[PDB]
Amino acid sequence: GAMGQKAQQKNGYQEIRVEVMGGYTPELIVLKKSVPARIVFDRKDPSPCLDQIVFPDFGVHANLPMGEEYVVEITPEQAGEFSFACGMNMMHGKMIVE
Numbered sequence: 001g002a003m004g005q006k007a008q009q010k011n012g013y014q015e016i017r018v019e020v021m022g023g024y025t026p027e028l029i030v031l032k033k034s035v036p037a038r039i040v041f042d043r044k045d046p047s048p049c050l051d052q053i054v055f056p057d058f059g060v061h062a063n064l065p066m067g068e069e070y071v072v073e074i075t076p077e078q079a080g081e082f083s084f085a086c087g088m089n090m091m092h093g094k095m096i097v098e
Contacts, residue, residue, distance in 0.1 A: 002027055002028075003027075004026070004027065004028035004029070004030055004094075004096065005025075005026035005027075005028065005029055005030065006029075006030045007029055007030060007031050007037065009032070012035070012036070013035060013036040013037065013038065014031050014032060014035055014036070014037040014038070015037070015038050015039075015040060016029050016031070016037075016038075016039055016040065017040045017042060017069075018039055018040060018041050018042065019042050019044060020041050020042055020043045020044055020045065020047075020050050020064060021044035021045040022045050022047060022050075023050070023091065023092065024084075024091065024092060024093045027092065027093070027094060028094040028095065028096055029093075029094070029095045029096070030095075030096045030098065031076055031095065031096070031097050031098070032076075032097070032098050033076055033077065033078070033079045033097050033098060034075075034076070034077055035075075035076070036073065036074075036075050037073070037074055037075070037076060038071045038072065038073045038074075039071065039072040039074070039084075040069050040070075040071045041053060041064050041069060041070045041071070041072065042068075042069040043064045043065060043066050043067065043068060043069070043070070046066045049086055049087070049090060049091065050064065050086065050091075051063065051064060051086070052064065052086055053070075053072070053084060053085075053086060054084070054085070054086065055072070055074065055082075055083075055084045056083060056084070056085070057082040057083055057084075057095070058074050058082070060072060060074060076095075076097040078097065079097050079098060080096075080097060081094065081095070081096055082094070082095035082096070082097060083095060
């Protein structure tokens with residue numbers, strides 16, 4: 001039942017809305033390669049483990065505003081299995097670049 005979510009392809013860039021409520025809604029986000037992609041993190045739950053988000057495969061660390069959405073713009077120049085989480089051995093977020 002662990003199905004992934006495909007991001008929407010816009011005019012030259014991709015976008016995906018990740019509903020943050022007790023965890024990450026889209027367990028695995030699928031995106032293309034060599035294309036600018038933005039991840040929209042909508043904070044619905046004021047969970048402490050969801051206060052900050054860091055991409056260990058991109059080197060991007062940002063904070064999420066409660067009651068609002070924070071977008072992370074990245075450029076996947078390599079095809080493979082990527083991931084995102086908060087802290088270390090916690091949360092669950094995967095990304096697949098074609």
